[PDB]
DNA sequence: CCGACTGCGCATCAGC
DNA sequence: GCTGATGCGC
DNA sequence: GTCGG
């Protein structure tokens, strides 16, 4: 990119302290420093420049003129040859494993992919999935194959209901040419905030997807939230397409612009938004946007018929879907 | 310097 | 069974 | 780790 090695620093720094350290408003600004350089138009020529931008303070600063110095980290080097924190880091790379899990099986023994084969039987469920697709969830999906997994989905969807209303979200709706996994908004008629008529929604469309064989795994399911794997079917004599993460979430229909600004994200550009919306006194989730009372607790759901009224509320300008890649 | 950090679904366990 | 806390993930 | 009150 631009400031790309500062960037992968804190990320790093980013993750060590989440999977390590299990520090976690440490990894939220460490991610909020990288998001914000990630923005900056000038390459970063000394720490004392970064440190203007907001999240930037003075251990960073001292970090990036350390980095600009060098062209690298201490502080990361040895990160990076404790083979325990490298071992720790590297079990979460498993979905299903996070840092307490992944700390549990290195103090136990377990520390390479190569030993939790042999001990499957220490693994819920999620991260045994995790674990069998370890290779293919590594991978990124082309803006291509995002095509086909949409037309498969939207198509399915349309079989088992005309009115449900099927959305890919995720960076493919932000322009990605490559996506992590596939995000799913869906709605319904039947299913508002006032009335739920018909239940099992979500249900009935992952069991098509299953029924045609595109959804393979479940890693969690409830009443509007999916986790799972699915897979392209490929042709004869072709290698098989990797196995890929997707997730549906099924949404109130009278809710979908707060769903579908939730599902575009980016995380990080959900996190400024929301902490934007509380500094004027909002709240939003991926229901609503509601009133913070002069008390500080939140009021009625506000009138919402797309997603710029979402904006207008706390006095942003609109940014479509590829500017919210932060 | 201080609190205060975005918001929540599903799995899971502990305490009833 | 429940509520609540924790884990993990979006 | 940072920061606005
Ligand atoms: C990183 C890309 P990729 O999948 O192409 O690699 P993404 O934007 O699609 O992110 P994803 O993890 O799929 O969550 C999908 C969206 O869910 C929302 N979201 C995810 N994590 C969130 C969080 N911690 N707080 C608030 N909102 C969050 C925005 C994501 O775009
Ligand atoms: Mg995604
Ligand atoms: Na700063
Ligand atoms: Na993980
Ligand atoms: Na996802």
Known sequence: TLNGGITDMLTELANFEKNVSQAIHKYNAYRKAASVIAKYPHKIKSGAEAKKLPGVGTKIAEKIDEFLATGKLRKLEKIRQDDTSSSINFLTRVSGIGPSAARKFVDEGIKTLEDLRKNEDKLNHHQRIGLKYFGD???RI???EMLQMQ????NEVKKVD?????????????????SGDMDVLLTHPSFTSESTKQPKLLHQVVEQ?????????????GETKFMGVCQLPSKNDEKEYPHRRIDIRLIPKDQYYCGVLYFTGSDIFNKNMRAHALEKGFTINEYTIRPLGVTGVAGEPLPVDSEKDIFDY??????????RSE
């Open 209 to 221: 997807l299953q029924k045609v064989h595109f959804i393979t795994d479940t890693l969690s399911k």
């Open 137 to 139: 969830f590594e991978k």
């Open 314 to 323: 706390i006095q942003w300008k609109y940014r479509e879907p590829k500017d």
């Open 162 to 178: 005309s009115e449900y209303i099927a959305t890919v979200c995720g960076s493919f709706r932000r322009g990605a040419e490559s």
């Open 142 to 144: 082309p803006r291509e």
């Open 151 to 154: 037309d498969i989905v939207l």
